[PDB]
Each structure stands twice: as C-alpha cells, then as structure tokens.
Amino acid sequence: IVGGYTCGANTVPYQVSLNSGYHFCGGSLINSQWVVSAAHCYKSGIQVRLGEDNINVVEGNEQFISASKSIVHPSYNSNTLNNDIMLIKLKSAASLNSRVASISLPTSCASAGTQCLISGWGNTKSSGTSYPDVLKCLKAPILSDSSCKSAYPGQITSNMFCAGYLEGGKDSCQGDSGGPVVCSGKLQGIVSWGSGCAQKNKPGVYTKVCNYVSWIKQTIASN
Ligand SMILES: [Ca+2]
C-alpha cells in the first residue's frame, strides 16, 4: 500500500496472510473454513495466517492453519487476468472472535463513488522498495467504468473495476495481491493488477467479487 496509513492491530479482522515460508499474498476470510484470494496467487504448500498484525513477530492473536484444497476459477486467464479469483479451504475451522472475523459477501454490486477500504502488507514506495511489517490501510473510491477503460484501453473486462486516484500517489502495490476491498461492510473486490504503483492515470485494478457470488456459494456447498 502506497500513501496509506497504519491500520492498527486487528482492526481488519477478515484480513489474512498467505505464507509459503514468507508472506507472498493477502486474502479474506469469508467463513470459518474458507478464504478468497487472487488466482494469480496460486501455489502449492500454502499456510494461511489469521489474526496477524506484525507478520514478523508472534503477538498473541494469530492462528496458523494449513490449506487442504485450492480451487482456481474455472475460466482464469493468466495472460489477461480475467477471472482473477480463487478459493482456499482450511484443514480445520478458524476460531472466530472480535480479532478474527469473516466478511460478508455482497448481495449487490457497488457503484462508482462508493468509498472502500483496501489493506495489505505490500510495498509502500512507488519507486524503490520498502516492505512494511504491520498492516497498512487505504480509503479509496470506486472509479467509473469509463475512466477505468480510458486508463487501460483494451484491458478492462466486465469482471474488473478500478479504484483509487487518477492523480496518483495512493494505490496498492506488489504484495498486496489477493487482498480485500471492502465497501459498506461487504467484500467487493480483490487486489489484482496495475501498471506500476501509484502512477498518474494508472489506478489499481480489482476483481469484481459481486460477479462471482453464485460460484463461490455453490463451490463452498459441495467441497
Ligand atoms: Ca504476528
């Protein structure tokens, strides 16, 4: 997260860290045994880390649970990043409390102008690299479908929306991938891709979760 703020320990209780020896992606807890992330975060040997603030220090509210199964969306296209979503089932159910909680799935798609909260442990600098150890937050609006398509000609599908600032300065970045975009208490997006970070006229692009509610629900009900 570039140009964000320090969230505060456990103020984003649905945020998860995916770990394969090191943090490599974010995700969101949607019930006691399932995590949603980006399909481009796929790999084998994932451990899901819940209740994290400082990802380098054991602070007392963590739960570490291995993944038992990962399901990449059936139509994921790694070249275009269309359908950039994936579900991960946990080996055992998480213990839900005030600091580890699920986030509701949306019943309707959010409109442009809606203010959202984006969070992650990604790079905080638009040139160079500095990776934070504690969770960073960003308030950003959803941008109009027309300004999004004008920023990225030929690359935006109906499964994507843009959020952020056309002036630049504030954005998600490398290592925020797979993390949540939450608007009015509902999971509306997944950190997917961008052109660099926080560059002028290049806002971040996010997977449009409201398009996938039926697939998520049916997948969970049968796995
Ligand atoms: Ca920790």
Exposure of 132 by Cβ count < 10 A (0-12 exposed, 13-18 middle, 19+ buried)? middle
Per-domain residue ranges of the chain: 5-7+103-211, 15-102+212-221
Resolution (A): 1.9
Letter for the amino acid at 181? V
Tell me whether strands 23-31 and 34-37 are parallel, antiparallel or unpaired. Answer: antiparallel
Q: Is 54 among the annotated ligand-binding positions?
A: yes
Give the Å distance between the CA of 136 and the centre of ligand 1: 14
Give the Å distance between the CA of 57 and the centre of ligand 1: 4
Inter-residue contact 121 to 105 (CB < 8 Å): no
Give the Å distance between the CA of 152 and the centre of ligand 1: 37
Letter for the amino acid at 74? P
CA distance 61 to 53: 9
CA distance 31 to 80: 29
CA distance 163 to 73: 23
Domain 15-102+212-221 classification at class level: mainly beta
Residues serving a catalytic function are 40, 84, 177
Give the strands of the sheet with 180-183, arranged side by side: 5-6, 136-141, 115-120, 180-183, 186-193, 204-208, 160-163
Retrieve residue 64's tokens: 């570490």
Q: Is 57 among the annotated ligand-binding positions?
A: yes
Residues within 5 Å of ion ligand 1, judged at the Cβ atom: 52, 54, 59
DSSP string, the chain: -BS-EE--TTSSTTEEEEESSSEEEEEEEEETTEEEE-GGG--SS-EEEES-SSTTS--S--EEEEEEEEEE-TT--TTT-TT--EEEEESS-----SSS---BPPSSPPPTT-EEEEEES----SSS----SS-EEEEEEBPPHHHHHHHSTTT--TTEEEES-TT-S-B--TT-TT-EEEETTEEEEEEEE-SSSS-TT--EEEEEGGGGHHHHHHHHHT-
Nearest to 25 by CA among 84, 99, 91, 110: 84
The architecture of the domain spanning 5-7+103-211 is Beta Barrel (2.40)
CA distance 145 to 157: 10
Assess whether the region 5-7+103-211 and the region 15-102+212-221 belong to the same CATH fold. Answer: yes
Structural method: X-ray
